[PDB]
Design a protein around this ligand. Sequence first.
Ligand SMILES: [Cl-]
Length: 280
Amino acid sequence: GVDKAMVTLSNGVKMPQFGLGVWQSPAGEVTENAVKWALCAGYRHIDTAAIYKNEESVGAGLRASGVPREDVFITTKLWNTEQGYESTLAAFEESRQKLGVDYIDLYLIHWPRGKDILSKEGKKYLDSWRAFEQLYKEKKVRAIGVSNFHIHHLEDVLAMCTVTPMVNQVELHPLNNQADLRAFCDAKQIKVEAWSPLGKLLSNPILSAIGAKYNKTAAQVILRWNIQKNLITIPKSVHRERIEENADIFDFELGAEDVMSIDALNTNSRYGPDPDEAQF
Ligand SMILES: [Cl-]
């Protein structure tokens, strides 16, 4: 079930495979309610970021839910402008105080930053990674990873790390299924987590026809496909009925032909920025 499906990270930490994204959920009551409703529906994983400016609301929603903090996995992320060693330690402290927690479960570098910034300012994600390693040694964070890293960015970290990144959270859905990145990450025990897992994609005729066989929606089909590919998935919604619907994917299974038809939809088409080309 949604509270029970887990992926074991390389350091043995159990990370719930399914969580609530609060990307683009407004700070205040909207985020508090989304978090509270998700926890009440059995979610045990919330994904936020400093740049979402809603970490206070995530903490407030968790407190409102009455679910013990030790039963919930909280991920947050270092924003691009704060990369660097001392600045990363500071950013982490600010995120921690806003969430109202003593420890964070997973901390991610949000982006590597685009190639023109790397060329002018250097690969500051490497020194941020050293600061992550220090936070992990100090027991301030249970797991560390990255977001929006391509294979080449990971190779840069793997050449210098004392602790391998445990998660890489990237744009991943049936139109951009990240097969090559997933093969590399599998080789290096880096778990792949899908952002924007639902991407007009939810009107796709193949997807809704598959859903019709199991009395599921296209969105539920996409999320079940995430689960069967052993991916971590964090669909975002602020609406209670959608938050509950998205998690109701553990009572059905996609067969081989279904999964093949979904894999066939790939076009390597991104809705979000390409991490190499980003001008931020
Ligand atoms: Cl089949």
